[PDB]
Design a protein around this ligand. Structure first.
Ligand SMILES: Nc1nc2c(ncn2[C@H]2C[C@H](O)[C@@H](COP(=O)(O)OP(=O)(O)[C@@](F)(Cl)P(=O)(O)O)O2)c(=O)[nH]1
Ligand SMILES: [Cl-]
Ligand SMILES: [Cl-]
Ligand SMILES: [Cl-]
Ligand SMILES: [Mg+2]
Ligand code: NA
Ligand code: NA
Ligand code: NA
Length: 326
DNA sequence: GTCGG
DNA sequence: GCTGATGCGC
DNA sequence: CCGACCGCGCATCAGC
C-alpha cells in the first residue's frame, strides 16, 4: 500500500480498457505497471522515477505526475461521470457477464442490479448464479475459513478414493491471509497423460461435495474443470457463512508440478513467467514445458520432477509460492 | 500502453 | 450431430 | 518504427 494511490489508479484504468474499451493489451499494460509499482520498495515521488521501472512508459509516467500533483486523474474523473462506462463496468462485476454481454445489456436498458434481477430470463446459467450471489462473491475469505474449507474438501475427497490428492492453490498456497475464492488442484493415479483408466473422476468428487452440501451451485462443469459455488456449514443459531466461488481442476498425475505451478499463480506471475519462457525458447502451460524449435513449433515435453525444474529450464532462480504474488 | 530489435 | 470461432474465466 | 503481448477449459453460437 506504499503507492496505493497510484496502483489503484492504474487498476481502475486497466479495468476501463478491458470492460469498456475492450482493449485487452492496454488492460495488461496497466496491470503490469500496477504490478511492477506495487512491488517497488520506495514511495514514488515522480513519474520519471516510475518510468525507470519496466512496464512504466511515457503515458503512465505523465499520469503519475498528474496524480501526485492533484491526487486524482481527470481522465478517470470523466470516466466515472460517464453513465454508459459506469454501467458497463458495474455489470462486468457479475460473474459470467463480460465486456460484450455488459455492453449488450446496457443497449437494452438493463443497467442496474435491480434491472438484472427483473430480467433473469435474459441471463444464461452462469450469469444467473453470478447475480444470485453477487454480494457474497464480493466478500473476501479469511484464511481461517480457507483452512476449514480445505479440511472438508480433502477429507471428503479421501472418502471417495484414498488415492485422490487435492491441493489448495491460488493465493492460499501463496500464504495470503485472505483469498477471493478457493482453488483446488486434484489428481488421481488412474488419470495420466498416458491414459484415463477411470471415467467420472472429477464428477465423483463434485458429486460427493454436493452430497454433504458443501458445493451448492455449478457455474460450469466438464471432464477436467469444475467452476462452482460452495459454503461452509454453520452451527445452531449462527448466521450462515457467505457462499464462495470454488474451482476444481483435475490434472494428469504425471503433470502435477506444471499443474500446481499454474494454479498457484498469480495470474500476472504466470504471464511473466510464460513470457520469459518464450524468450528463453520454451513454452509453458499447466501440463508441460516444451522447447521451441527453429521453426517455432513446440517440441516434446521436457522431464519435470519439481516446480524448481521448470524455473531452471528458463534460467530463473526458484521463487517460493509466497513470492509469486504479482 | 510498453517494449525490444 | 460436427467443427470452429467467440465470450468468459482461471 | 512495429510487431508482440500466456495459454487453455467450458458454454454458446453459426454454419454445415
Ligand atoms: N496462465 C494463467 N493462469 C491464470 C490466469 N488467471 C488465473 N490463473 C491461475 C493463477 C491463479 O493463481 C489461479 C487461480 O485463479 P484466481 O483464483 O483468479 O487467482 P488467485 O487465486 O491467484 C487470487 F489471488 Cl486472484 P484470489 O482467488 O485469492 O482472490 O489460476 C491467467 O490469465 N493465465
Ligand atoms: Cl489493446
Ligand atoms: Cl510436471
Ligand atoms: Cl501440452
Ligand atoms: Mg483464487
Ligand atoms: Na520504464
Ligand atoms: Na464478469
Ligand atoms: Na479461482
Amino acid at each position: 500500500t506504499l503507492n496505493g494511490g497510484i496502483t489503484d489508479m492504474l487498476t481502475e484504468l486497466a479495468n476501463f480498457e478491458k470492460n469498456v474499451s475492450q482493449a485487452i493489451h492496454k488492460y495488461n499494460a496497466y496491470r503490469k505497471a500496477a504490478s511492477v509499482i506495487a512491488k517497488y520498495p520506495h514511495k514514488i515521488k515522480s513519474g520519471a522515477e516510475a518510468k525507470k521501472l519496466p512496464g512504466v512508459g511515457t503515458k503512465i509516467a505523465e499520469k503519475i505526475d498528474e496524480f501526485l500533483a492533484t491526487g486524482k486523474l481527470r481522465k478517470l474523473e470523466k470516466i466515472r461521470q460517464d453513465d454508459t462506462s459506469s454501467s458497463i463496468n458495474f455489470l462486468t462485476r457479475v460473474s459470467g457477464i463480460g465486456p460484450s454481454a455488459a455492453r449488450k445489456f446496457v443497449d437494452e436498458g438493463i443497467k442496474t442490479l435491480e434491472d438484472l434481477r427483473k430480467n433473469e430470463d435474459k441471463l444464461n446459467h452462469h450469469q444467473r448464479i453470478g447475480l444470485k450471489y453477487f454480494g457474497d462473491f464480493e466478500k473476501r475469505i479469511p484464511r481461517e475459513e480457507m483452512l476449514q474449507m480445505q479440511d472438508i474438501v480433502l477429507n471428503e475427497v479421501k472418502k471417495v478414493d484414498s488415492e485422490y490428492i487435492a491441493t489448495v492453490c491460488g493465493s492460499f498456497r501463496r500464504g495470503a491471509e485472505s483469498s477471493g475464492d478457493m482453488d483446488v488442484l486434484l489428481t488421481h493415479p488412474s488419470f495420466t497423460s498416458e491414459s484415463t483408466k477411470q471415467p467420472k473422476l472429477l464428477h465423483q468428487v463434485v458429486e460427493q461435495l454436493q452430497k454433504v452440501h458443501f458445493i451448492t451451485d455449478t457455474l460450469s462443469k466438464g471432464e477436467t474443470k469444475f467452476m462452482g459455488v460452495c459454503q461452509l456449514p454453520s452451527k445452531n443459531d449462527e448466521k450462515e457463512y457467505p457462499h464462495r466461488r470454488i474451482d476444481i481442476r483435475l490434472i494428469p498425475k504425471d503433470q502435477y508440478y506444471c499443474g500446481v505451478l499454474y494454479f498457484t499463480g498469480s495470474d500476472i506471475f504466470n504471464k511473466n513467467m510464460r513470457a520469459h519462457a518464450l524468450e528463453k525458447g520454451f513454452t509453458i502451460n499447466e501440463y508441460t514445458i516444451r522447447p521451441l524449435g527453429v521453426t517455432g513449433v513446440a517440441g516434446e515435453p521436457l522431464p519435470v520432477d519439481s516446480e524448481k525444474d521448470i524455473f531452471d529450464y528458463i534460467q530463473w532462480k526458484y521463487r517460493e509460492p509466497k513470492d509469486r504474488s504479482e
